[model samples]
Target: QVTLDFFQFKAEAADWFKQAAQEFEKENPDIRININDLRTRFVKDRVPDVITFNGDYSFGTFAASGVFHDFTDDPLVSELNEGMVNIAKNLVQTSDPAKKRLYGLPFAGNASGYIYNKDLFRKVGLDPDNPPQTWDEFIAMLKKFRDAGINPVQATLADAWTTQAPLASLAGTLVPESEYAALKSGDTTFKQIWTEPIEKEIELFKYADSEKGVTYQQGTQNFAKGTAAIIPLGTYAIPQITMVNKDIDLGFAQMPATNDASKQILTAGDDVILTMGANSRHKEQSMRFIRFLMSKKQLENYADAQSAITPLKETYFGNKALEPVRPFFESNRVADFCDHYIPSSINIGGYLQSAIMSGNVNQFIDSMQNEWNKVQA
Candidate 1:
């Protein structure tokens, strides 16, 4: 009997896990697998054999806290993707390779992008088939929607992390990926790239949903209620929106490229690998579960259901639901290190990003710029 415990905020993920467990049980009837929702009780009880989490940062927390076992020398490491391998190598290369031992597997992959209303685009004389490719074009289209008496965009800024992701995406377009990487690695300071483009994005946030005083909550709520035409959301939001609003027409597209060709196309989210509880009774079982999760067939199925680009060689041709984004995924060179890839000085909780979503872009940028200057100095 293997009791697998995973924590997830999204209910659809919970539903999917239930389905996966039923499938797993049917395939291996002799094996008893228990899937439990993530809660504080499980965390305190030390009850789960296999635990799953989405962000690389969470892996760092568990690994650093001495709760997870060291599987750095795991032989199965060879089977994973090169990108995953490189990330594992970087983590292991640090001071504590044992704790950094790869125990977790890439359960999911996500990237940030814009989700728009197909019907709204058609109503406003914009082609849903052709989304805005440039930042200027995107803003112009949004303005067109607003001028046509339609709210251009919807976003929930009350949650700081929500605002930070897009702000980081905008920042990534101005700041080179290499520079962001350097900042994370401590080789360079954030000030090396803070410039006008980031400021411009801040300016735009100043006016997003101006009727609401440039402040709003439940970004997707506007989309659901049909009050707004577009919103920036991660791939994870796909299941929630599609499941609830099957009748509404929706489309997904790449983050609009910054006019400066040097910086364009933002990519976020790193599904990382980490070790499980050192004293866990099912450490071996945990490792096996992680392996099973990352297999190509499982990854394809998960990505397909989640409406995301699978980090595998599989083509997404038949999924007409994801057609709007199919071209962008193939053609665009992704700008990594927007949020998930960066290591340090990147605070998801910091006021640097929350201020914008909370109707305070100028304050956020001004303070963040000052912090950058101090770090650079």
Candidate 2:
């Protein structure tokens, strides 16, 4: 019997993965599954037979280093949504276009947007169903909410990473993903590209009162209780809000970056990426498990449990609150998270927090540019 090791990093869906592994083991009596969540093995010589990880810069870095199995030509990969497939490709670390290849299957997707209270919209005499598609209208809505004695935005500035939600949402549209590469090659810069996004984010923060902008848990909890009309965050935050107030009337809308709503692209991410080691000896067994997990039933079940977006062309979204952004995925007008391209070593969230507290856009932009210059040196 072959023993296939599985390394899964998604603690949120641990029960689902373990159950799936048990079911797979029962069906494939000749194979034994060993599950490990600790990721220290990535530095060792041999790695797991099957692995699931967040599709961030680290995933790209590893894939570029030949740490994962290549699935560029796999027939199974052809059925995935092209937008999502491109995310996996774009996440690769190498600058060489020829070197970038499909290193894993897109397991699930997440999106960044503003979660709003429909009841608050109605209370403020705004149409609950007709969300603002233009930046001007969005700001106007905030002003109206403020005039009605409501906290217009829910902010989580206390938790450093929470700042990236709006930043990612804004950056997703303001700066095209290609500009990152251009910036790296000294062809563009944060001064030229990032100013508008950060400026807009700071403007939105003006709507939330000092008491409202707290830690992530406090922010989401207050939003759940209708403390604020809107919270700039991603789909990953929905579960937390729901857990706090299940009856909250919620709607998720793409953060419109420009006056031209038709030109907007939604900021989404491959939250979970599934793959196997490049040199796994039990290839057949590993493949069988992966295929089983990628099946429609397994995919849908996992997505439903985690409130994620499936990688299939049909794009099954687990939550109905995400209906507003459906057209973006359907039309493939989506951008991966901007921070995914920024190295985590940069303390980006801390810098963002400081920028907001200091109200210095140049300081943020200059810091990013200086860090990029030093890191890329």
Candidate 3:
């Protein structure tokens, strides 16, 4: 029997993956699956035969280092959503288009934007079913919330990483991702492409309850309890809110970037990327399990349980809270987290925390330019 090592990153999905392995083993009869996790084995030159990792910069680092099998030419790539597949391809560590290849399949996607409370919206006399589609309407809605004595947003800045959410939400729509390559190559910069987004973020924070005092956990809880009208995070934060208050009515909406309602793009990512080791000895056996997992039935089940968006032509998101943003996914108007391309060494969130606290947009932008310049130098 060929025993394939399956490495999964999310602890919340462990039992589900374990059950999946058992089912596959029962049917295959001759193959075995071992589900464990990350790094130590890689240093020993022993990578897992299969893996389900978050499609973030760390994954890109490993994928580009040739640790993961290149799935660029695989039939599986064609089966996934075009936008999601493109997100996977763009995550590769290289800036060159020719070298930017798909190392894994986008299994489940998570959206990044504002997760507003439907109850709060209704209380403020705003239609929860029809979220603002343009920047003007968005600000008007915020004004109405304030007039109704509702804090428009919850800026969770106690945890530095939380600041990246709204930044990613705004930049994902405002910036052209291709421009990032130029910034890396010294042909352009964060100032030129990111200034407007930064200004917009500063403006949005003005309506937040506590600009730099709330933590992610507490902010979610606060929003859950109706302390704030909205939490500018993502679909990933929904679980926390629901756990805090099970009946809290929620709605996830993409932050509108411009006055043109027709051009808004959702900030979503390939949250779960399924891949295998480049050197896996059980390629044939592992590929079989991968195929089974990638099937619509399994994908749908996983999405339902994880509250994720399935990577299929006919996409399915299990959580009704995600209904507002579904139109972007259906129209293929989605972009990866803008921060995913940022070099992790920069401590971007720390800078965001300071930026949010001081409201000094110039200092934040200059510091980014300095730090980014130092890295390149």
Candidate 4:
């Protein structure tokens, strides 16, 4: 039997793949598949036949190192959504003319913003259907919730990555694509372009229940119990929150724009990416498993279970709770998460958390500049 090794990083979905493998093996008795966690075994020379990676700077590094097989000529590549395919190509650091060649297949997509409670909004005398479209209105709503003796926001800076959610959402609207290009080329500084977004994040923190050093688990439980009005997280967290209380009336919306309401947009990123090993001996078996996983039925089931948007054309997110932000994805009013594009050594999320807590914006900006210089050098 030809055995194909699969490496996955998502711990929550471990059982899903295990079940899927059993089903797949029954149909192809000549082939066997082993699903394992992608940890220390993901070295360059001993990589698995199939691997899943986060679609961020790490993907770029892996692709640039020539460890992944190019999927440009695969017929399955043509079946993916053009927009998502373009995103995968851009993140892989490729120079193809059509911008269609990709090193990984986008398996799942996620959007970042605020997930608020409709019941809480009504209690605070705010319109649940018409969420805030500008920073001023958003802050007003928060203050109203606070005045009503309710926690306005649930945040967990105890987990440093949690700090990047609001910062990335705000930056998606405040900073343009040109500004990021300029920052990379030494034409602009982080402090110069990121001041407004940083200040806005601080203002929102005034109403957050972070004083107790809440962790992600505590924050999710509190939000599900209706102890807080809002949770600034991505679609991936919806599963975590609903597990606590599925009866909670929740609504999703884009983070309000900095100055212009019309400029408001959703921050989007890849939740999981699938790639083939460049030097795998069982290429045919690995490709068959990938094709099986990407089938319409399997894809829908996986996306539904994870509460994630599908990266295939003509397919939408399976979770009805995310209906409010559907228009943004449909109209393509979305931007890539800023942290995904930055060098991993910079630790943008950790730096932002420390800067916000210590009130040391200058030091944070200077440190970012130095890291950028080192990466460029």
Candidate 5:
């Protein structure tokens, strides 16, 4: 009997995972599967035959350390969606340069955007149906909301993720999409990739009242309660927002382009599957599970369950909710997420983005440039 163990970061997906597993069991009756919410407990007790997650930069650490299996020559790899292949190659060619091999299967994915309250926009006489597509217009819309006594944006720098989320989106609008990953890996400097646009974003966010600009406390709470008119967040916030305020009318739109010349590029996050205990008893089964996970049905189930906007062939191109952001996807061939394009040893996702969000503009640029120098060292 073949048994596969899986781990995921989503604590909320426990029920969804169970449902998918049951269906999987029914389909493959001879295979045994066990999934645990690793958000709380992720130990190396017995490395699974397959581990699934998004953002290879985070997952690549294990892969680089030989904790995951290499699928470089796996024949079945050619069958994956073209976008999936591009992302895999992007990671190998850009982020994990030392390990120029495929390490995991891309699973769920996410993108950054603005979530607006329909009621709030309507009350302020702004057309919620037509969201701002330019950074200038976005600020104008916010001023209109403020004039109508509505706080235009919901911001929280305290939790840090909130700060990083929109900052990345803002960076996406101004910076060339292809350059971001390289910048993170220290192969390129922020002065070349992010300095001007990142400075502009910080200046724009500074316009808000000191107390209202970015509250550390009650960030998500305020947005969920309808007190905050707009919040820049990832698609992962959708399910939780729905659970918090079902009646709150919500709409998703791309972060406005920094200027007319800038494209509406966006960042995405996803899950990847890595193999552990490579030479162990389950090596073959683990490899099998990784191949099995690349199927259309399996990828669809995981993407939908996790509220991810995956770049899977079966999921994104025809997806209804994602249709709104189609232009952004179409315009940019590469999607940035999980800092996957950056080198793993640099820790760009952790310290750099945080420094950017904390208003330490010079330090952010300096830190990122220093890392880039180190990458070449």
Candidate 6:
């Protein structure tokens, strides 16, 4: 019997993996697979045959360490979306530039923006189909909701990562694509690029509900229950929100542009990535599993279940609720999440939350520059 161990990090998709594994085992009775939550260390001795990673930021360090198998010549690599493939390639770090190869498959893609309640919009005398296009219009709508005795925004500040959704969305409009690279090369500082976005974020915080300590789960529940009109998050949260209350009329829109309405764009990035352990005993079996997982039907089924975008050419998000943001993906009007490229040691997510909460623009800018300098030095 060939036994394959899989380590999965997405807690919400645990059952989906178990179900898929059961289906795969029935077809290949001699092959057995074990899917375990990522509760253990991922060192060489403890690594599983197959593991999931969070795109580049978290996986780059491992790729540089040579802990993952290189699948550069794999035919399956041709089937992935070219844009996502480019993202994976950029993450690879090697001394020999020509030797850089893809170390993982893009399993899922995510688009981040604002998920708003259509019913609440209509109730507040705003057109449900036409979301706010400019920052001023967005704030006006929020004020209207507040006057109607409704919470305009549901913010989950207790979970620091949730803070990144708005930060990334705002950055997409304010920061140029080259500006992030410049910051990394020490050509510019966060203060220079982030001043406008930070001020804009603080302005929106005025309309948020008084749930300062709200957790992610609680925020989802509140939005699902119609306690608030909008939740600034990504497409991944759609499934969880719908599962909690399927009757909620949901709509997604690009975060309002800071100045020019046309500048609005979706913040997009890898949601999950599939990689194989370099020293796995079951190399052939592990590759087989990955091949099965990447099948068009399987990819669509997973996308449908997770409300994620398929990282395959000609494929789109199966969740109808995400239709509003589909145009951005098609037109390439999207930006990579800036926080993803920021060094994790800096904890941009937590810093974003603290800065917004304290309403201190200079303090946040200083902290980010200081942490970045430490990493560079």
lDDT: which candidate is best?
2
lDDT of 3 by residue, 320-340 (tens): 888988788777788778888
Better of 1 and 2 by lDDT: 2
Count of clashing residue pairs in every prediction? 4, 0, 0, 0, 7, 0
- Model 4: lDDT to the true structure: 0.81
Q: What is the descending TM-score order?
A: 6, 4, 2, 3, 5, 1
TM values, all candidates: 0.77, 0.92, 0.89, 0.93, 0.78, 0.94
lDDT, residue 97, candidate 3: 74
Please list the residue runs of candidate 5 whose C-alpha ends up more than 4 Å from where it truly belongs after superposition.
1-3, 22-32, 37-45, 72-79, 93-99, 177-188, 207-218, 269-277, 283-298, 317-321, 331-334, 341-358, 371-376
Best by TM-score: 6
TM value for model 1:
0.77
Model 4 poorest 10 in a row by lDDT: 92-101
lDDT of 1 at 67: 50
- Please list the C-alpha lDDT of all candidates, in the order they appear: 0.57, 0.87, 0.85, 0.81, 0.61, 0.82
Residue 92 displacement (Å), model 4: 1.8
Q: Supply the TM-score for candidate 2.
A: 0.92
**What TM-score would you give candidate 6 relative to the actual structure?**
0.94
Compose the digit string of candidate 5's lDDT tens values, residues 246-363.
5667777677747673556666545444344443467765555555666676667656655565545545531243555666666653356534545656655456446645778788
> Which candidate model has the greater TM-score, 1 or 3?
3
> Listing every candidate in turn, what is its Cα RMSD in Å to the true structure after a full C-alpha superposition?
4.7, 2.3, 2.6, 2.2, 4.4, 2.1
Native-to-model Cα distance after best TM-score fit, residue 299 in candidate 1, in Å: 2.8
Clashing pairs in 6: none
The residue-by-residue lDDT of candidate 1 on 170-199, one tens digit each, is 665666656754764468644455545445
Q: Which model, 1 or 6, shows the larger TM-score?
A: 6
Model 5 residue 249 CA deviation in Å? 2.7
State the lDDT at 95 in candidate 5. Answer: 41
Instruction: Report residue 348 deviation for candidate 2 (angstroms).
Output: 1.2
